[PDB]
Structures are given as C-alpha cells and as structure tokens.
Ligand binder design. Structure first.
Ligand SMILES: CC(=O)[C@@H](C#N)c1ccc(Cl)cc1
Length: 313
C-alpha cells in the first residue's frame, strides 16, 4: 500500500531484568548462542558457564582449562563452544554434555580471542604470542599459523562466508586475511597508531568495527579504506572491550566501558542513545541477542556478574 511507512526511530529503553551470579573472578566474555536459547560466559575463574538467554537461569558449568579464560564463542549450530585460555590452549566443547572434544595446542602464550567460521569447520584464534592460528574443528589440529602482528592479538573474526579473517593488535594495526591461503590482503593504518583493542566484521561483512585505546570506536569501509562513523563518549584506554552491532530493533552500536556503563549509540547519527547503569566494575563484554531486544553485559572482578537487559524496541 502507498500508506506503508518507515516507522519513526525510537530510542531503546533497555532495563535490567536479571543479574547472573556464580563466577568467582572477573567475567571476560559473554555470547548468545545463534539459536537464541543460551548465553555462554567465560571468566578468569577458569570456568565457562551457560545460562538461559531469556530467563538468566544457570544451566551448567563447563570446566577443564588450567588457567583463566579470555573468550568463548559458539558454533553456528549452537552445539559447540570454543574457549581461549591463559593456559595457552583453546578447547572445543560439546555444550550438551559439557565435555571437552578437543584441546587446540600450538600457541606459545596466552590465547586471547577466538571464533568459529560460519561453516563452523574452522576456528580462528589470536594470542599474546602475536600470531593468529587457524584450526580444523574436526581434527583439532592447527592448519595455519599467521605471523599476524608485532604485539598481542586482541581480536579475530571471520566474515559471513568465512573467506576472510580480520585481526587487530596492540601494534596499532588491523589486518584482513584470506582464510584459504593465510595471505594478508589489507592492512589498516593510523598515523597516530593507537593500540587496536577490538575488531569485527559488520553483519553483512561490508564494514569493520574497530576499537582503539583512545576511547574511540570506528566503522570502516575496508574495501574503500575509509572511516564512515566514529563513536565516542565512553572510556576505553586499557582493556580489550567487545563491541556489537545491535540489529533486532533500532540499529545500534553497543559497547562496555571502563566507567562501568554499557553504551548504546545510534549507528547512523553516532549519538549516545542509552547508558546502562548497574555494574560495579569495568564492563568488559557485551552481547546482543540474535532475535530479541536483549543485551548481556559482563564486568570485572569487583562485580563478577553478568546482567541481562531488555528493551521494548
Ligand atoms: C540485519 C542488519 O541490520 C545487518 C545485516 N546484514 C547490518 C547491520 C548493521 C550494518 Cl553496519 C550492516 C548490516
């Protein structure tokens, strides 16, 4: 109908619904399962915990790492997790049984970041050892070691068909890699060169969102090599804080912050539309539910909790 219209944009109204207690040290990452049913958390306490995505109810603890965990990530079918640990390994877990399927050995220092590719036949990892590794999920063996950076690797992420990996480092660089060959296709340069603390592809793989330790998030068109948007106002000078695209309602950028708040920006206008108060330490990780307007946030060791926030839009 000619009267069909685009709705007037409405600011979100995320409100605290649940606080998820159980970790005994800083939480390091939270991620919603692709099927929307579960939230996984990792912690410096060496544990992974699974919680109901909608009701926040504790489901199970997954144990096995010998030291703290920095990151955890889901396979596309929501059946597997991979975790990255200070014990220098990654582990692949069967979520239903809680059992460790494979231990991925090869990094020579702390593993800081990890992700499955969309096909979920590969895992990519990044380490304090300055390398990015690509692993075969089935065999649990390392396929490629990329001499990716000259300082610790803060983030690694596949694009939507797994043909590219983006990595970031404290060396100040973002790099795009051809998954199949391991060859570097592009390097992003900042002449001021602040450490890059996080990077990920946009949900359509057209852009990359990168955090630098000067309180700044940037949306880059990596094919044109130009910055489209900048998001500021939060505090990020020390930690590798995740950022997200929220796409279930209004299109937002979401990030934790060193002032204990969750920041939500309008993706287009770059204005802060909400700040979520409640955590009592640095919000190191946030995640956005794949279908409902729900955010998970996780905080460092003065807090140790995960919070679930829900919005009407
Ligand atoms: C379903 C969506 O909104 C997304 C897709 N695909 C999306 C969101 C934000 C950006 Cl910048 C790109 C793409």
């Amino acid at each position: 109908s000619a009267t069909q219209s685009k709705p007037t944009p409405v600011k979100p109204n995320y409100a605290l619904k649940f606080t998820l207690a159980g970790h005994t040290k800083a939480v390091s990452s939270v991620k919603f399962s692709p099927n929307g049913e579960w939230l996984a958390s990792s912690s410096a306490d060496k544990l992974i915990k699974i919680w109901g995505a909608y009701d926040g109810k504790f489901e199970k603890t997954i144990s096995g790492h010998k030291l703290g965990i920095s990151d955890v990530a889901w396979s596309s079918d929501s059946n597997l997790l991979v975790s990255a640990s200070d014990d220098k390994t990654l582990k692949i877990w069967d979520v239903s049984s809680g059992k460790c399927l494979k231990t991925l050995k090869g990094h020579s220092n702390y593993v800081f970041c990890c992700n499955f590719n969309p096909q979920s036949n590969l895992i990519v990892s990044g380490s304090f050892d300055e390398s990015v590794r690509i692993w075969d999920v089935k065999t649990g063996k390392c396929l490629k070691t990329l001499p990716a950076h000259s300082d610790p690797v803060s983030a690694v992420h596949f694009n939507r068909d797994g043909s590219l990996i983006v990595s970031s480092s404290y060396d100040g660089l973002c790099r795009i890699w051809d998954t199949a060959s391991g060859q570097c296709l592009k390097t992003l340069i900042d002449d001021d060169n602040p450490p890059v603390s996080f990077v990920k592809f946009s949900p359509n793989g057209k852009y990359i969102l990168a955090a630098t330790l000067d309180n700044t998030l940037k949306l880059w068109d990596y094919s044109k090599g130009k910055c489209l948007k900048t998001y500021t106002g939060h505090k990020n000078e020390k930690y590798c804080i995740f950022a997200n695209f929220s796409v279930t309602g209004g299109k937002w950028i979401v990030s934790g912050s060193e002032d204990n708040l969750v920041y939500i920006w309008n993706l287009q206008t770059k204005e802060i539309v909400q700040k979520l108060q409640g955590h009592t330490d640095v919000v190191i990780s946030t995640a956005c539910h794949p279908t409902e307007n729900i955010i998970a946030s996780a905080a460092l060791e003065n807090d140790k909790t995960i919070k679930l926030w829900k919005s009407d839009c």
